[PDB]
Nucleic acid binder design. Structure first.
Length: 367
RNA sequence: GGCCAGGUAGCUCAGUUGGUAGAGCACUGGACUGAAAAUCCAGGUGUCGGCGGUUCGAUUCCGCCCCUGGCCACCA
């Protein structure tokens, strides 16, 4: 219908950017971005009115948003900056070549890939490539993005792009950029499954030292990150129904040896989940004594006592220890499995004494 | 879209080591009246958002959604 409405209005609309990339990468997404030559707002309004759905105009931005089923559609007028702008002009202002392509929805040429800068080739050769030298200078946030992309798609930075990147951070543009954009970029990054690789690019190009204050790289933290990777693998393998957000753990490991002030400040800027702040504040002090307690553990019931109150995160942190690993595993796939029949429980009930008694019975079963 | 709170009666508001819920004004009922109100006795003041899960047991622990408000990024 889009090419039809566009036909009627004498306009040209195209699918654009990341979406196109994801399409070419065989990834399906519910968020599609259109670029219209001519008024995009009217296109969106007509579309929404024909499908009979609510529409959300933004006349100052020149863009509109509408949802059809699970599809999320964003229409945007072609512009030359961040006279009518040509498609080519709207594409030239984007970050990397793999993000620089477009696909016509117009009825006559429909299905035709439009590639000006050779984004198809770079996608073909697995290349993260900036459109112009000045790129990272314009938007320093791209610095992270490139890395992020290179991590997820497992692409490589072109020599041009790499040189310009190193030069971009060397000029300290990372500190000058808006804190919010950067922080959000990182928040995106940690949600990747390949986020570890991204951290590797982060360490390689030394961007973390600029954004975080007091952060430095060493071997212990790195090995901790890999051990965390393995633990995450196993946990997300057998216990996968119990999954939580893993990237925050890697973040915690990164900020572990940091001062608590800059740590709480960082988690504050990062708007981390409550369980993340809890796990961090618990890790900063109590964790040592907890480990020392788990070392003194003999009976299984004491282990149950020191463990069960804690969240999954803390346990995943305890799996870092070689000595504690089999113990925590034993706690997970074994130590908690149990129930009690009717008559017995009825006799157990014959206040808090019911709970205490049940605990006495459980510790009677364990040891 | 991420996060933070706030979610408690009809309205306005507190409540942590999980263990049997509260205030101020409206609600019914009766004593009171010619009727009404005040006031007295009292006692409804409630699946403490919705739904699952862990637990003997969840307002609480966790997960997914609902609403409102505020900080935030809002194309790539």
């Amino acid at each position: 219908m889009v090419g039809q409405i566009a036909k009627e209005m004498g306009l040209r609309a195209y699918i654009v950017g990341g979406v196109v990339r994801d399409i070419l990468l065989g990834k399906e997404v519910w968020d599609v971005d259109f670029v219209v030559e001519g008024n995009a707002i009217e296109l969106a309004k007509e579309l929404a009115r024909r499908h009979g759905v609510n529409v959300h105009p933004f006349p100052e931005f020149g863009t509109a948003h509408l949802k059809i089923g699970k599809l999320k559609l964003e229409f945007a007028t072609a512009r030359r900056e961040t006279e009518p702008a040509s498609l080519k002009e709207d594409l030239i202002r984007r970050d990397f070549t793999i993000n620089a392509m477009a696909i016509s929805v117009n009825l006559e040429d429909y299905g035709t890939l439009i590639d000006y800068f050779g984004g198809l080739r770079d996608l073909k050769d697995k290349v993260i490539r900036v459109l112009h030298p000045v790129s990272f200078i314009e938007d320093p946030v791209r610095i992270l993005r490139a890395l992020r992309f290179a991590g997820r798609l497992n692409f490589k930075l072109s020599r041009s792009t790499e040189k310009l990147l190193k030069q971009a951070v060397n000029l300290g543009l990372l500190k000058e950029a808006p804190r919010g954009r950067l922080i959000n970029e990182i928040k995106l990054a940690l949600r990747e499954d390949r986020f570890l690789e991204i951290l590797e690019l982060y360490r390689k190009y030394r961007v973390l030292e600029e954004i975080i204050e007091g952060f430095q790289w060493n071997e212990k933290v790195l090995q901790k990150l890999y051990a965390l990777r393995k633990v995450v693998d196993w946990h997300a393998l057998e216990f996968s129904e119990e999954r939580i957000d893993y990237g925050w753990l890697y973040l915690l490991i990164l900020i572990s040896n940091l001062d608590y002030e800059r740590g709480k400040h960082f988690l504050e800027e990062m708007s981390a989940p409550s369980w993340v702040r809890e796990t961090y504040k618990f890790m900063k002090f109590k964790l040592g004594s907890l480990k020392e307690e788990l070392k003194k553990a003999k009976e299984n019931y004491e282990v149950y006592r020191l463990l069960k109150p804690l969240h999954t995160s803390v346990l995943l942190l305890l799996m870092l220890e070689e000595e504690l690993k089999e113990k925590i595993k034993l706690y997970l796939e074994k130590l908690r499995k149990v129930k009690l029949p009717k008559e017995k429980i009825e006799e157990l009930k014959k206040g808090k004494e019911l709970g205490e008694r049940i605990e006495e019975l459980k510790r009677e079963i364990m040891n």
